[PDB]
Amino acid sequence: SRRYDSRTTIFSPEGRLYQVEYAMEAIGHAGTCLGILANDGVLLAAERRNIHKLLDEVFFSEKIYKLNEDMACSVAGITSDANVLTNELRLIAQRYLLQYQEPIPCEQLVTALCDIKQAYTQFGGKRPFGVSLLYIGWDKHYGFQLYQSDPSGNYGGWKATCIGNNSAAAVSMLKQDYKEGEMTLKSALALAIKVLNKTMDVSKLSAEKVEIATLTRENGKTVIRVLKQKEVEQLIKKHEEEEAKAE
Amino acid sequence: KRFDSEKAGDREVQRTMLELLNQLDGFQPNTQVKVIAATNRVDILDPALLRSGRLDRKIEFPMPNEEARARIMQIHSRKMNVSPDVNYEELARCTDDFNGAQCKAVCVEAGMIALRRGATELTHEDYMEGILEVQAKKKANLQYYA
Amino acid sequence: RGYSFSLTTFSPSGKLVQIEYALAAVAGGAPSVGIKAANGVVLATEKKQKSILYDERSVHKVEPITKHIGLVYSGMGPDYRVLVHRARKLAQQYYLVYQEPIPTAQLVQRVASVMQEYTQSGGVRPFGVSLLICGWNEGRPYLFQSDPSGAYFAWKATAMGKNYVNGKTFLEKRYNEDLELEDAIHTAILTLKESFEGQMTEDNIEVGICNEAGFRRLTPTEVKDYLAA
Amino acid sequence: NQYDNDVTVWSPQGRIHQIEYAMEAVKQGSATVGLKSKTHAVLVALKRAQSELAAHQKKILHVDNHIGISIAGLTADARLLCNFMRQECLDSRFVFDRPLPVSRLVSLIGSKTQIPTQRYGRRPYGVGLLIAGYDDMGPHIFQTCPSANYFDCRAMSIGARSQSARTYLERHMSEFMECNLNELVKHGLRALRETLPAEQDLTTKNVSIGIVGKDLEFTIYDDDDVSPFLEGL
Amino acid sequence: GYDLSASTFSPDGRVFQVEYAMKAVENSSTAIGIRCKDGVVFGVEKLVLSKLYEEGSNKRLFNVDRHVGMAVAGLLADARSLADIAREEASNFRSNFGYNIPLKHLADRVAMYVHAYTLYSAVRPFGCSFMLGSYSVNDGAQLYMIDPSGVSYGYWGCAIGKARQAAKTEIEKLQMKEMTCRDIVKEVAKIIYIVHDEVKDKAFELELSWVGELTNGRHEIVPKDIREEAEKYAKESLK
Amino acid sequence: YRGVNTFSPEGRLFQVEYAIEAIKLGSTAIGIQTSEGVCLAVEKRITSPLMEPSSIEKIVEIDAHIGCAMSGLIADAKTLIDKARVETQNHWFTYNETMTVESVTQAVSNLALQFGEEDADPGAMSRPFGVALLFGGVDEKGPQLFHMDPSGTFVQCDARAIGSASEGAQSSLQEVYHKSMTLKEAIKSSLIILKQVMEEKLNATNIELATVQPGQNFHMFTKEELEEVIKDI
C-alpha cells in the first residue's frame, strides 16, 4: 500500500539519502573501533561496549571477526546487521577461493560487500544495513592493508582511522601523531592505547573495555591474534608511566 | 459529539448542548413547544441529542432525482416567460448530480442569458447555457479525447 | 500479495523505534530468570494464570529444543511458539548434516538470524519476545539471551520482564562463581520471588534445568519440593 | 476528499468515485449513435479533429465479419479492448468454425473489464463502446461502460451532448424495426445532427458509418463513401 | 481514517469497508425469493432506466447450474462476476465427484470466495447481495442468501435491496410452508408491486424464475403466459 | 498517495496530463506532408558553444522510408525509436514487405501508455513517455505524416508543429500550408516559421532537416544543402 510505505530509497529535495544519513548517525553512537597500519603489521582496537559483572566470556572476541586465513574485521553499529554482513563476507571470500584457488585480495572483498550495501540503498524498499566496518589483511598485491566501509556502500583505504563514538577526536589525534611510513607494530599499539585513553571519556582504560587484535606475517603465513589480558594491561601500565614521566 | 479533550472552548458549547438536551426532554416534561432541527452532518452529532425522546423523527433529504429536478425547474420558472419548447425532462437528464439550489441557479442563469441576448422569452438553448454556467466546469486547454 | 517494504526504518536520531517498542513489549512481559551454575544451568519463569479456570499444565513456557538445549521467554506467547518451532527445525537440520547435536552457541546464532530477518524484511514487525537459551556441550554449560533486534549475549546470570532492573541488581549481589546447581536453583526461585505479588505455588511458576544428563523440565512435585525450603 | 483516490476504496454512500470519473471520461468524448432494425444494425459516429490540418480521429473499428464497435473515450484503451475482442472472435472461429455470438462476446468484455475495478493499483478502462453485430438471433446493439456493465439496447447514443441524440432516438424508436437500410441510416444521422452545436452541419469529413446486416458483412463508410447517405437529409 | 481499507479494524471492531459495500447493495431495486413445498420462486423489480433498453437487458436472474438459480442486487458488474464463479464451482464439483453439487455446499463455497475479499487491502468487498435456490427430490427445495461480508444462511423468504423491510413485512403473511409454486408465483408478483414506489421510480419490469417439481428440478424462467397471469393478479390486487 | 493509474474528476489521467505538459519544454519541431514528399525540421537548441551540435540527434531514421522527429524528454524516445526499428525489420522478415507509416505509428503508440505499478511486470515502465513523435515516410499510400502524443493517441496530419512554440508555429502553418504545395515550398515554409519561433538566430548548425520522397530514401540535409536553403529563406 502506498499510504504505509516509508520510501526508504528516494532522494531528498537537496539530493540527499536521508535513510543513509540517519544510519550513519546511528553508527556515530556505537562502540569506538580503531585501526592502525604499521610497517610489519596491522591492528584493530575496539571499545568493548558491553561491560557487566554478569556477562560471560565466550568466543575469541566480541567485535573482531575472522574472515579468512589472512583477513579480519571489526564492526560498529547494529550488531544483528553486522552478523549478516560478516557471514556474507565469509561466503564471498570462500567463493573466490573456490573459483581461483587463491585467497581473495582484501580490496576485492571490501568491494564485493560494498556492492551489496549499495544495492540496498538503490532499490528494494528495505532499510540499509546500519553498520560500518574496518578491515585488516595481507595479500601478495599490496601487503598489509586497512579499509573502511559505510552504510552507503562507500569504502576507502586508510593508514589509520576510527569510526564510532568520538571519531572526530580520535581521527584528529591520529592525524597529528601518526608517522607515515615509519611506524612499527609496537609504536602502533602504543598509539592505539593513547587514542583510546582520551576518546573514552567515561572512566579510563581498565584492560576490560578494550579488545585489540593484530595481524602479522610469520614464516610465510598470516597470523591473526587477539591480545590477552596480561599484555593489554602491560600496555596500559606503560602508557600510564609515559604519561607520568611527561608530567 | 462530546470528547475527553484538554482544549477549552468546546466545553462551553457542550454545556449549552446539555442545557438544550434537558429542555428538549428531561425533568418537567414539555408538551406545548415543538422542535425542528436541520443539520448538514449527522455523523458528528452527540448520541444524547439524536435520542428517540428528543429528535424522534429523523427525516432524510436526498439529492433530487430526475423527476425532482424537473419539478424544481418548473417551480422556479413559473414566474418567468418561458417558451413552450423547453424539455424539462431533457434538462433533468442533463443536470445529473445537482441540488435544488443548483437547479434554481440554472433557471436564473437562463433568464440572465436571455437578458444578455436581448430576448423577451427564454429558450432551451438558454437553459442549456445556464446549465453549463452552473456546472462550473473548466477546460484543460486541449481535448485529445476521441 | 504482501508488502515488500520494510516497516522498520531509522529515525532522525539514528534509532530503530520499532525495535525499541518490541523491547518495551518484552519489558512489560512476565519475569524470567536464568542462572549458569558450575555444573549446569537453570531457567525459571512466572506462570501466573488469570483465574482458577486456566489449565496450568496445558501450555509450557520452558520448552526443550533438543536433548541438551532448552529455552524460556519473556514477552508475547504466540511469538514464542513461532521461534520454538523454528529453533527445533534448525536443530534438526544441523543434526541431519553433521550427525551431532547442534552446539548451543550455533543454535543461538541461527535463531538470532531468524529474528534479525524480521527487522529488515518487508511487511513484518519485530518479534516482541526475548529468549533465554541454556545448553550443555563439550562438558560445559552455556546460557544465552537473544533479543528482538537479533543480537545475542552470553550471560552467567540474567533476568528479563517486569522489574528486570531490580532482578539483575539482585542477581549481581547474590551471584558467585563457584555456586552449585542446587544453590543456583534456590537463587533462581528467590530472584522471581523478589517481585511476585502473591503466594508462589508449584502451579504459579515453571522451572527447567540442563546438565550433563541433558535438559529436562522439572516436574511440579520437584518445583513444590524446592519451594518448601 | 479521501475516498476518490483508489478503485478499491468504497465511499460512505456506497460509491466508488474512481469508477464515476471513468464514466466521466466517455462523456468528454465525441458523440456516436447506434440503432438496429429487423435486418440491420447501424453505427454512425461524429469524428472531430484536434487541428484544422489534422485528420479526424477514427471512431469505428472492425472486430470480425459480423461485429463492429464505435468508441468514445481513451483511444489507447479502445485499441486494447478492440484487440481483445478480435482475439476472442478469432479463437471462436478457430475452435468452433463458427462466428462468436454477439451477446457472448459482450459478456466476455464485461468479465475482463470488471477485474481492474476490484484490485489495488489497477484502473477501469476509460472507454465506452457501442457494439453492433449480427448473429443467428438477428441484429444486435450493445452499450459498454468503464464500469464493467453492459446493456442490450435497441438504439443508444454516448459521448458529449449525447442526451439530445437519445431524446430523438426515444421519440422515433417505434419506426426503426420496419424501416429499410437507407431509412434506418438516415435516422441515425438525424439524431447525430441534433447533438451538433447549432451552427454546424454534418459533412463527409466528420461523419463515419458502419453497417452490418443479414447478408452484409460489417462495412465502414468514410470520406466520399458517406455522400450517398447524407444526400437527402 | 479507519474506514479506508478492509484490512483494518475500527476502534470498536468494525470493518467499515464491508459496511459501505452493504450500503451500496441497499440502493438497488428490491429482489425477493420465496421457498415453498414444491420448490423455489424468484422475483426481481427491474427498473427501466431508459425506454431505449431492450426487454430482458441487464437480467438479474441467472442459472449458475442447470438445477440452481441466482438472484442479485447491487452493483451488477460484481454480481455477474460472482455468477461466473458459482458456475465454475458447480462445474468443477461435477467433474471431480460426478454428481450435481448440493445447494448448501455451493452456497458455502461461494460464500468463502466472497469472504476472502474482506481480509486484504489488495482487493475490495463485493458490493452485491445474491440468493441461490434449487430443488432436488432427495434434498427438497432450498434457498440461501449471501451478503458482502460473506455470511450465508437458509431462508424461507428473503428480500434484498431498497425496500427490504417492506418486502419482509409482506412476506411474513404468506404462510409459504404449505403452498405450491403455482400459487407462490402470483404471491411473489403481488409483493413486488406493493413494495415498488411508482412516485419515485418511473416504471419497472417484473422478472420471474422458479425451480421445483413442476420444472423437474431445473431452474428456468417462468413461462410468459404464467407471468402475464401473475402480473394481472398483482395489478388487480392493487385496487 | 495518488497512484499512477488515477483518474481526475474530469476523467483525465493525472500522469498523462503531466506528461503532455512536459512536451512544452521541448524544442520546436515541424513536419509538412506534400504530394512530392514529407519534410521534417527541428530546432537543435544548442545550450553552450562548447557542445558539439553533431551529437544532438533529434531526427532519426526508422527505416529507409520512415523518419522520426522528437520533442520533449529526448532520453525517453530512445526506447520508442528502438521498438519502431525492430518492428519494421520484423515485418520485412515475416512478410517481405515494408511496414506502412500508420502501422509503425500504431505499434509505437501501443507501446506507450503500457505503464503500471501493481501486477504489471518485474520492471515494467513506471511512468508514461514524455515525448511527442512526428513520423514521416512514404508508403503504398504515398507520403504520410503522423503525430503521436504521450497519451498513445496518433493521427495523420497534413502539417503539425510540436514543442515549446507549438502554439504560434501551428498558427503560421495554418496560413501558409495548402494541398498543392511542393516539397521545395514546404521546406522553405518550415524554415521560415522555425526562424521566427527560435530564440537564437537561425543558421546551418543549430537546426536539423530531413526529407523522405517517393524515389529517394530517408535523407538528412548536410551543411552544404542547409546553407543553400537558408540563403533564399
Place this chain on the structure above:
Amino acid sequence: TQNPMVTGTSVLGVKFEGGVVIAADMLGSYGSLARFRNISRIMRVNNSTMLGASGDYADFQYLKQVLGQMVIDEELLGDGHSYSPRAIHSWLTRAMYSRRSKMNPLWNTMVIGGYADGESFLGYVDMLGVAYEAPSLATGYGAYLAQPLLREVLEKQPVLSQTEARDLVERCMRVLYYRDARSYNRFQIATVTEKGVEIEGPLSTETNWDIA
C-alpha cells in the same frame, strides 16, 4: 493414452433423408477378452447431435464428461445459441489434434451425426486430428467390411429413406459380427431427426445363418 487398455470396435454411420443413424456394439474388449458386455459407446451430445466412439473407452468417457459439461454451460446462458453438429465436430478435431501434438493422444476414432437447419451432418475424427464429412462412415474394421456395402448402395442411390438406412446398417452390423473377432451380438442404434436424438435398446443380430 500411450497404450489403450479397454477398447470398443467399429462404429457405423449413414445419413438419410431427414436424419442420421449410428450403430455400435456394447462391448469393451480387454485385448481379446469380452470383458464388459453392457457398455454403451454412443452418447447424446445435445438435442441435435450424437457421438459414437471406438478405441480406448476411458478416453471416450473423458470426452463424454468434457463435452457434456460444455453443453451444460452453453444451455445455462439461455441466449438462443446452441452448438451445431459442425461446431462439435470442429471442437473435437482441435481437441484430438492438440493432444496428438503434445504426444498424449486420445486413443479414439469418433463418428459425429446430427441434424440442424434441415440438413444432415456426418463427420469423422481420428486420434491424429484427421477429420472429414462423408455420406457414410465406418471406423475400425467397419472401414474394410461395412464401408464397401454402404458406399455401393449410396453410389446407386444418393438419397436414402430412414427405413432403407436402418436396414442397411443392420446388414452391415451382421457382416461385422460374422468376420470381426472383437465384435459382439448386442448393439445400439442411435437416430437423430427433427424430433431429436433417440437411442435404441440392446438390439441383436437375430439374422445369423450358420449353414456349415
Place this chain on the structure above:
Amino acid sequence: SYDRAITVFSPDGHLFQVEYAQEAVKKGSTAVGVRGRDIVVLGVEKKSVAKLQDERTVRKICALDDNVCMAFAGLTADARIVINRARVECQSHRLTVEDPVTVEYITRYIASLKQRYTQSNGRRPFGISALIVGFDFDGTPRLYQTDPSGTYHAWKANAIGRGAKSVREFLEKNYTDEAIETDDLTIKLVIKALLEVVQSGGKNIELAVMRRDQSLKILNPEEIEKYVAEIE
C-alpha cells in the same frame, strides 16, 4: 519484489527524482575534461588529501577499456556500479563485434542504463554524471558527458560537479585552436580551469592523460607541480 513507481511526473511536467539526482551531482567534487588535437585530458579537484587516506583507492578517474576512460561526479557508490556495468559491456562488445568499443557506443550504453533507472519500478535514479573520453579506432579523439536523466552529448570541453558553471564559463572563453595546439598546452588549460575553483592548486588536483596509442596515464605530483609552476 518492491515495485513502486519511485519516479513519476509532477505538475508542470517535472521529474523531481531526476532533478534531485542532479542536485546530488552538483554537490560532488569538480571534474574537467578537454579534447585535444591528439590528446584527451581529464582533471578533477580533490576535496582534501587528509594526509591519512590511501590515495590509490579513491581515484575518481577509471579506465573502462584500453581506449576509453571516464571521470564521474556524484555518489561514489553509484559510480562504482555504473563503471562495472560499462566494463563488462566493453568486454562483451569485444567478444561479439570483435573490435574495440567506440566512445559513442559506450556512452550510449551508460546513458541508456541511467534512463532505464529513471523509468523502472522500485528503483532510484543514478546520482552521477560522467565524462567519457577516448580514441576511436579511426583515431579521432572523443569526449562525451552523461547526466542522471539519461541524456548525453559530445563536448569539445566540459566540466561537471561543484562550481561547474564557472569552470565551464572559463573554458568557453579560453578554449581555442591555439590553446589546444600542443599536448602540453592542452594540459595547462585543464589545470588553469581547475585552479579557477580549487584553492590550493597542485596538491589538490588529480590529472589523467590519454594519448592515441598509449594507454591511460596518471600525472605524478612532481609533474603536476611543474605544470602549475609554469602556469604562474
Place this chain on the structure above:
Amino acid sequence: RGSSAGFDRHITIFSPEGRLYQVEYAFKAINQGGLTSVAVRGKDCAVIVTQKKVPDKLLDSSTVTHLFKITENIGCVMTGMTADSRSQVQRARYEAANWKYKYGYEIPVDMLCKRIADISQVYTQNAEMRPLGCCMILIGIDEEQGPQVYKCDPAGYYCGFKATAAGVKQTESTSFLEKKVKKKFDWTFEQTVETAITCLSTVLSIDFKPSEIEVGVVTVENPKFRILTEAEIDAHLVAL
C-alpha cells in the same frame, strides 16, 4: 498509556508502549455478534453451549448454528464475526484431515488448537491482512488424557481450560464458572450440561426455552461429537 506514533492504530505494528492495537480491536469485534458461549469439562465428558438468536420467522433456524463438527471425535463452537468463523472452521477441518492422512492417527485436540493458533499468529505479524475477529473452542476425548477443552483467540493465545466462556458476557460467565469450579469439581457428571445451561441462563437472565440454545457433547463412552436435539435440550431444561 495510549500514545500513538505513525500507523500503529491502522496496521499490526507496535505502539510506543509495545501494544498491538489492531489485535485488540479484533478482540473487540468478537462482541459484535452479541452472542455468548460456554464450554465446561466434566469428569468423563465435555460440553459446549451457546445462544441461538433467530431474529425473525423468515430465517430457517435449521441452518443458523454455531456448533460444527471438525472430525468424528472433535467438535467446536465459534463466536464473533460469522464469515470469519466459518472460514476458520474450514481450515480446521482441512488441517485435521491432513494430520490423519500424514501421520496415520486422529489429530489431538491440543494439536489442532495449536495449528489454528499458529495460523492466526501469522495474521498479527504480517501487515497485509487483518486478524480474524472470531474465537474458537474445541472439545474432544484424548486417548490417555480424558476430555479436553481448548480455546484460541485472534492474537494466537490458545491455553487449555476446565471451564470457559466467550462473547458479550465472557467476564460474568468466567466468574460464575470459577465460583462453581472452586467449590467441589465444577460438576463431575454427565449432568455437567446443567451447570453450563445454568451458567448461561444466569448471566443473560433468559430462562431459556428449548429453541434458544444448542448443545454439543462428547463422552468417554461415546467419543463421537453429537449435537443434542431440541427434545433432549428440553429434557435438561425441565430437570433444572
